[PDB]
Amino acid sequence: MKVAVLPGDGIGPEVTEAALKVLRALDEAEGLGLAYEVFPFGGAAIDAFGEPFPEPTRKGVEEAEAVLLGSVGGPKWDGLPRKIRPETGLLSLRKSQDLFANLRPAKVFPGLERLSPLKEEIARGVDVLIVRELTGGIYFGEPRGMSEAEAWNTERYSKPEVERVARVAFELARKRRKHVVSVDKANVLEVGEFWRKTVEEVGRGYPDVALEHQYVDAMAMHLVRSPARFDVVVTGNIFGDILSDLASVLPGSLGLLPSASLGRGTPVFEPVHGSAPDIAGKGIANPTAAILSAAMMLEHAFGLVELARKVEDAVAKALLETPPPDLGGSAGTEAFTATVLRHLA
Amino acid sequence: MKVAVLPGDGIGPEVTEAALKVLRALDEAEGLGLAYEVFPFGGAAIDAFGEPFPEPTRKGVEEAEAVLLGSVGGPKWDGLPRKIRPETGLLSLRKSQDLFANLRPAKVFPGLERLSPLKEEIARGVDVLIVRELTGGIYFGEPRGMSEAEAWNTERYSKPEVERVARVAFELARKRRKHVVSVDKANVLEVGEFWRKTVEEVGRGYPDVALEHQYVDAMAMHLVRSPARFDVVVTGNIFGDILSDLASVLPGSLGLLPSASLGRGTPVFEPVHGSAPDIAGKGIANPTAAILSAAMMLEHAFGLVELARKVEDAVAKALLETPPPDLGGSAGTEAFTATVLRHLA
C-alpha cells in the first residue's frame, strides 16, 4: 500500500506523525506492505518551492494509492496572492485528481455521549455519513456577478454530476446499513426535482438499498432531533456544506472529526481541523482526527475494513482512558497515541 | 382592533377558533375593542369562488389592521393547476400586501427546557428571532429551468430588497436586546458579498445595535452549540428556511411555532404547521402555534407587548399542565385552550 503523506503546516506534522506510528505498528504486526513518502504541501511547500502544490508533490500524489493529509494554512502566507495561497493548493489537489465526493462522518463513540450538545438518549448511536458533491453547484455556477445595484449566482447541476456522486453514496451505503437519504429542495426548485429524479434513476441499480428523499430545511431539523436513524446522506455542494457543519457538532468536539474526498483519482483523507499555529510544537495537539483519517484510508482506499474498525475501537478507548487536553484531559499527542497503541497490541 | 380572520383548510378552523377564544377573553377583560370577520381562503375559497384568494377576502385583508391566518392546503386540491392551488393564495396575499420580512421566533420557555433535544444547559435562555427575506432569492430567481441533461436556478438580490429587510431586523433588535447577526455566504458567493455590504451600510444608521456577520454553514453550528447568545438573525429566503426550521427543534417541536409576515400592507400572523387534513374535525389538534400567533399579533400589530407576554406565559403553563397528544398527553383542543384561558386571569 503506497501512501503519499502531505503533513502540511501547523499541528499538521504532529498529528500526521501520530497516525503514522499507528500505521507502522499495524504494518509490522501483520506485514501490510505499507510504503509511504512525505511531500511538501501548503505553507511548507511555498517556503521552498514558491507554490503550495509543486511538481514533486503532484507526481507523488499521482503514483500513490492514497493521500494522508495534515493541515494547511497559517498567517505567514495570508498575505500572498490568492493564486498561491495554501488553500489554493488544496483546491488544485482535488481538481488534479477529480475528487467529486466529500465524505464527512459524524458519530458519537459509546461512552462519549457526554460531550455531545444533545441529551444522552438522542446522541447515543449516532453514526451518520454525509456525502457532499464538491465540483458543482452555486459555488461554481455561471452566470454569476455583482453590480452596484444587484448580485446573482447560478445553482446549476448536470445529470453526470448528480449520477457520479449518487453512485458513491449507494456504494458506501451497501457496506454500511443500506440506507440512503437524498436531500434537496425539489418542492421549490428545478435543480431540486432534477436531483431527486436522477437519484431515483440511479437507485434502480441498488435494489438492496433503501432510498429516502428529504428537503434540506427538514433534514436540518431531523439531524438535531433524531440523528441516529440516518446512515448515508447524499446532497449537493452548498447543502452538503451546511449539513456537514451541522453534523460535526453532534460528537461534541472538532478534534475527533476525519474526512475523505473520493473521485476519479487518488483518494485524499484528512482531519477536518485547521492548522492551529499557536499550539503547534507544544505537543498538546489531539491526533484523533488524523488517526481516524488513517482508519478511513484503510477501509476506503485499501478495503481493510476489519483493521479500520480496530483502530476506531482503540481510539474510542484512548479517549475514555487518557483524554487529550481539549477533552478536559492532560494527555499530549505522544502519550495519547501510546494509549491507542496499547489497545492496538 | 380590526382583525381579518382566514381559518383556511384542515385544522386551520379549529386552531384559529382556539386563538379567537383567547382574544375574546382578553377583549372582555381589558376592553380592547376587538372586531373581526372571517373570510374564505385556500381550498375553502376554491370550493366557493374557484380561487384561493378571492376579491371579498382581498378587500377584507386590506381593510383590517392585521390578519389571523390558520392553515392552508389539502389533498383535495393538490391536482389543481398551480395558478389556483391553495398554496398560491399565500403568494398572492403576501404579494398583495407587500410583505417581505418573515418573523420566526424560537424561544425556550423557562421550565420547558426538558422538552428540548439539547442538553438543558444549552437550551436554557434561548430567545432568538430569525427574520427571513420573503420576496426574492433563488425561490423566485430568473432564469430557471431544467432539461434532460441539466437544471438551473438563480440566486439574485437587489439593493432595495436587502435594505428593507435589514432595516426591519435592526428595528426589531432595538426593541429587543440590541444585537443582530446577518447570515450570508460572502466567502464564496457574490450575493453573499453584496448582502453583507448592504446590511453593513444599513447598520450605520443604527449605532446602538451591535451587528455581527456569519456564514450560513457556521450559524448552523452556532445555533446548536450556543443558541442562547443570539438575538435577531437576519438572512435571505432559503437560508432563512433552513435556519428557522433548525431553530424550531430547540424549543422542542416545529408544530408549536408562530410566525408574522411584515411589510408595507396588513401584517399576517400564522402557524408554521400544516393543515393536517386527516386529523381535522376530531379535536386533538394542538392550537399552541395559533394562540402564539395571536400573541405575536398583539405585540407587533398593536403594540400590546405585556399582553403578548401574558398569553405566552399562559400557554407555557398549559403545555406543562395539560400537554396535548402531539406532546404525549391527552388534553385535546378544547381542554388545552381551557387551561390557557384558566391562566389568562
Side-chain angles (χ1 to χ4, degrees):
Chain A
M1 53 187 247
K2 278 270 293 297
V3 184
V5 189
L6 281 44
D9 317 296
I11 64 179
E14 297 176 60
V15 298
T16 294
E17 174 52 40
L20 274 176
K21 285 190 168 64
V22 168
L23 290 182
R24 285 190 303 252
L26 272 32
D27 185 60
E28 217 204 339
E30 288 181 78
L32 301 177
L34 168 67
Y36 71 82
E37 189 161 316
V38 327
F39 295 89
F41 181 81
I46 295 172
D47 283 353
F49 294 86
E51 55 176 314
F53 191 38
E55 186 184 271
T57 306
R58 296 181 171 144
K59 250 59 184 63
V61 170
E62 289 179 32
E63 303 181 329
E65 290 168 45
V67 170
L68 183 63
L69 210 166
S71 289
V72 177
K76 183 187 308 165
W77 316 277
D78 292 352
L80 281 280
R82 173 182 295 140
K83 189 172 84 289
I84 56 179
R85 285 285 269 129
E87 307 80 71
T88 307
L90 201 29
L91 272 300
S92 304
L93 203 201
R94 305 204 203 303
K95 278 206 178 295
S96 74
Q97 305 308 307
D98 195 5
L99 301 174
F100 60 80
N102 186 221
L103 282 49
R104 290 287 299 267
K107 74 192 298 168
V108 171
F109 286 128
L112 297 174
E113 283 81 18
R114 32 170 296 270
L115 269 39
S116 191
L118 305 185
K119 284 172 162 69
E120 282 63 34
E121 326 79 57
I122 315 290
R124 177 157 49 243
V126 177
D127 178 22
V128 59
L129 184 69
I130 301 189
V131 178
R132 153 184 171 194
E133 209 283 316
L134 279 175
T135 72
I138 192 166
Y139 282 178
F140 305 100
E142 298 283 340
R144 56 192 305 172
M146 172 172 19
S147 78
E148 168 78 289
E150 63 158 35
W152 56 98
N153 279 280
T154 308
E155 164 81 321
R156 179 192 301 296
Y157 262 110
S158 58
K159 198 182 181 184
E161 297 185 304
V162 184
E163 300 189 309
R164 72 209 294 221
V165 73
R167 296 202 194 95
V168 167
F170 280 107
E171 293 299 328
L172 272 39
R174 267 196 168 155
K175 326 299 187 56
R176 312 176 81 227
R177 292 171 287 205
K178 293 88 175 302
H179 178 29
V180 180
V181 181
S182 190
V183 185
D184 57 42
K185 201 56 204 287
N187 62 331
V188 187
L189 310 172
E190 285 81 348
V191 182
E193 70 175 64
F194 182 80
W195 184 276
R196 183 167 300 202
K197 187 181 67 291
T198 304
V199 180
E200 283 190 14
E201 180 230 0
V202 170
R204 244 195 54 90
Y206 305 85
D208 53 287
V209 182
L211 176 65
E212 176 195 3
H213 294 299
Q214 290 245 47
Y215 294 130
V216 64
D217 45 305
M219 190 52 146
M221 267 181 50
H222 296 327
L223 277 186
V224 184
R225 63 121 57 176
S226 53
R229 65 135 306 210
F230 304 104
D231 183 30
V232 180
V233 173
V234 67
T235 190
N237 207 336
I238 189 173
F239 289 167
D241 209 331
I242 306 169
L243 294 183
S244 288
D245 274 40
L246 178 62
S248 67
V249 307
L250 277 28
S253 183
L254 179 64
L256 303 172
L257 312 165
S259 69
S261 301
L262 284 37
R264 174 191 59 72
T266 304
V268 176
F269 305 85
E270 53 174 308
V272 163
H273 65 58
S275 46
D278 301 338
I279 65 162
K282 281 62 184 69
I284 56 170
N286 186 190
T288 301
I291 292 168
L292 293 179
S293 306
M296 274 193 89
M297 175 182 84
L298 298 179
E299 175 171 23
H300 293 103
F302 302 106
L304 304 168
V305 188
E306 30 280 353
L307 258 191
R309 302 276 78 80
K310 297 188 176 186
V311 175
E312 201 173 286
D313 297 331
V315 170
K317 280 179 164 296
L319 286 167
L320 283 151
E321 192 176 315
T322 55
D326 58 351
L327 282 204
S330 44
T333 322
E334 290 273 33
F336 178 85
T337 312
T339 307
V340 171
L341 287 168
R342 284 205 299 286
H343 295 286
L344 231 44
Chain B
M1 49 185 180
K2 294 158 68 175
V3 185
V5 185
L6 282 51
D9 324 319
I11 61 180
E14 283 179 81
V15 304
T16 307
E17 188 43 53
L20 287 166
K21 293 185 193 167
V22 176
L23 246 16
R24 296 198 291 273
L26 288 180
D27 182 44
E28 299 171 39
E30 321 301 321
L32 262 29
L34 170 72
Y36 73 89
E37 306 127 78
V38 348
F39 299 85
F41 195 66
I46 300 180
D47 293 39
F49 302 93
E51 58 187 66
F53 192 38
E55 202 60 59
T57 304
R58 302 177 169 138
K59 303 199 67 282
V61 325
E62 73 177 36
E63 296 175 0
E65 306 180 84
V67 176
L68 222 209
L69 178 63
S71 290
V72 159
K76 188 192 298 182
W77 311 274
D78 276 50
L80 307 189
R82 181 163 302 302
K83 294 154 295 304
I84 64 167
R85 294 176 77 167
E87 312 79 73
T88 294
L90 271 170
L91 271 299
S92 299
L93 171 58
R94 288 175 175 154
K95 190 68 184 59
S96 85
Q97 307 299 310
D98 197 33
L99 307 180
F100 50 79
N102 184 39
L103 276 57
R104 289 267 240 114
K107 192 173 187 297
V108 165
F109 295 118
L112 280 292
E113 295 80 19
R114 282 170 55 101
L115 313 193
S116 182
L118 282 7
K119 280 173 159 63
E120 294 167 39
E121 28 280 358
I122 103 178
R124 167 185 54 92
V126 174
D127 185 11
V128 49
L129 175 63
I130 293 76
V131 176
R132 158 187 168 224
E133 200 292 290
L134 275 187
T135 72
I138 193 171
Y139 284 175
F140 312 107
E142 292 277 15
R144 49 196 302 156
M146 64 176 284
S147 54
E148 189 195 353
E150 71 166 35
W152 59 95
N153 277 277
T154 305
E155 171 79 329
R156 189 187 305 257
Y157 265 116
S158 71
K159 195 165 185 296
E161 288 183 297
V162 180
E163 289 174 290
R164 297 190 289 181
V165 308
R167 209 169 306 282
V168 173
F170 284 102
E171 290 167 29
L172 258 19
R174 268 185 160 154
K175 303 164 195 168
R176 259 183 160 259
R177 293 181 305 271
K178 304 193 176 187
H179 168 45
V180 174
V181 182
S182 172
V183 190
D184 53 58
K185 191 50 182 156
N187 61 333
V188 189
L189 304 177
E190 282 84 343
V191 178
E193 293 164 51
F194 180 76
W195 178 279
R196 187 169 299 214
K197 185 188 305 179
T198 312
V199 179
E200 205 165 66
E201 155 204 287
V202 177
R204 288 192 288 97
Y206 301 84
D208 61 310
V209 182
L211 174 66
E212 174 187 335
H213 296 280
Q214 290 288 313
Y215 300 123
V216 59
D217 67 301
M219 255 305 271
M221 297 176 85
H222 296 341
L223 274 178
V224 181
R225 293 161 64 184
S226 52
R229 48 170 284 235
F230 302 111
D231 187 21
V232 179
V233 180
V234 68
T235 185
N237 219 321
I238 184 167
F239 288 177
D241 260 319
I242 304 178
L243 292 189
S244 61
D245 275 353
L246 176 52
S248 293
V249 302
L250 282 44
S253 307
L254 176 283
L256 314 170
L257 307 190
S259 76
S261 296
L262 276 29
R264 275 63 180 247
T266 322
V268 179
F269 308 84
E270 68 157 340
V272 191
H273 67 59
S275 47
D278 314 299
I279 211 66
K282 318 202 194 317
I284 108 123
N286 189 184
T288 302
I291 304 176
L292 291 185
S293 292
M296 278 191 91
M297 185 187 85
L298 265 25
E299 198 197 347
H300 297 89
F302 308 105
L304 287 316
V305 186
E306 282 89 344
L307 272 177
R309 295 303 169 270
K310 179 155 191 174
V311 348
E312 285 169 20
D313 174 58
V315 319
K317 297 240 173 62
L319 286 175
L320 263 192
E321 303 174 0
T322 59
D326 70 313
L327 292 194
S330 296
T333 319
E334 240 90 21
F336 187 83
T337 309
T339 310
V340 180
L341 287 169
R342 171 160 63 85
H343 295 276
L344 255 9

